[PDB]
Design a protein around this ligand. Sequence first.
Ligand SMILES: [Cl-]
Lengths: 247, 247
Amino acid sequence: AVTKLVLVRHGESQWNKENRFTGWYDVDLSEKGVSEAKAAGKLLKEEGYSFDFAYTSVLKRAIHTLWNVLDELDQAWLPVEKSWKLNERHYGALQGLNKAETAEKYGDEQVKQWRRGFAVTPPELTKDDERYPGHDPRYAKLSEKELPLTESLALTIDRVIPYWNETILPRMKSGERVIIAAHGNSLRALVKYLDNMSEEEILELNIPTGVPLVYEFDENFKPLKRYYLGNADEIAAKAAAVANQGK
Amino acid sequence: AVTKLVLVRHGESQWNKENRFTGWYDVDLSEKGVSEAKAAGKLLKEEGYSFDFAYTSVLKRAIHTLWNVLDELDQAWLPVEKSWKLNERHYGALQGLNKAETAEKYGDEQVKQWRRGFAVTPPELTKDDERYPGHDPRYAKLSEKELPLTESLALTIDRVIPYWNETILPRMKSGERVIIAAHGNSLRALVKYLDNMSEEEILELNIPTGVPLVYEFDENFKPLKRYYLGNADEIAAKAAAVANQGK
Ligand SMILES: [Cl-]
């Protein structure tokens, strides 16, 4: 039989709306993002999807997207595992800054590189910064080397793909239907790996907020196909890159 | 050091409001119950409580109480384990019936016995009944003997206390701060065991919806003290037994 995996980026966050770099800052869903999360769950139900297990990050924009989806499915009882390994790419000293203001002060091309350059890291925090993850109780079990000062997509891959191979994929292989509710760069990391994409190809991909992305796997767990659920015109428009100045 | 445990009964459910026997029927919180759940979380924060791990049932009135509490604590990231072993006592063929109507048809004393008699079971379902737990996907892993047709408090103890001793108490002993969000009879089962109560004593106890109940344990994990958090006059009034005809 074919095995299905469902991926969903968190619904729009308040800092997505306000055009601020977020990273590990734990911002909530906007009002529109709550709407998006509920719509994704209703659509999954309509399309005949239910699950056996869910993975998400430790960031509330993703966790709350999952809770809203589970309620639409009448699966609030589902087992859930919440892991920092699925967190958004850390944005270093850019966390909290407005993207347009930052592009004006430092240059539009510099901001594009800090957003998207494959192995490029945003400017680093120091450990005394209020934003350093070591101060936060949900990272109490992490080492200095695990606690980021900044991350690139390359470094995001280096934590997401081991979690995939050690934990998520084996659960799928045991016959369980998995949903992953996560973030732009953690899901881009997984998609690059599953789709055999180059650095040039992954730089072009934007996964839109709140849109289910379904993968089919064959009996050897080689990906067979992937597709979005919902309104094609709306999704494709939403998957275009947005300027630093906003939409 | 003293170890703290926090217990909380689900916020008021829609069938609590409507005076219907619920059991394993998966009814949601009423509007007032959502208010109660959020208030419990805000109070726990104000009183200096945070957690390392949460247990709850597979029934949404309890799960949603926990989600609301965790959001007030800014601990949506907390590890959660959802177990049928913490479910409400199953109400057999009474599930969905109005308590007042049932007391009129069968007698007030008969209803009191079906509600509260220690080893008394409500009238049984048959396996073909739409309400039989075997039809529901979240009990797919249970055996016939685990799937109830009816339960008493005695039978509720027989599943809650092993879960306590095998799973919950060891986690506490490892130094983790636990919260349990559950149900009237599953929490009464645990309290009887922890408080060394007789059958006569436990029959008198009503744990009110949405009220934190804190236990202190000594170094040998013998209970030292237990107390409610919140407004004493309001809580004590709410802990009185309500007639079959309602309040
Ligand atoms: Cl959860």
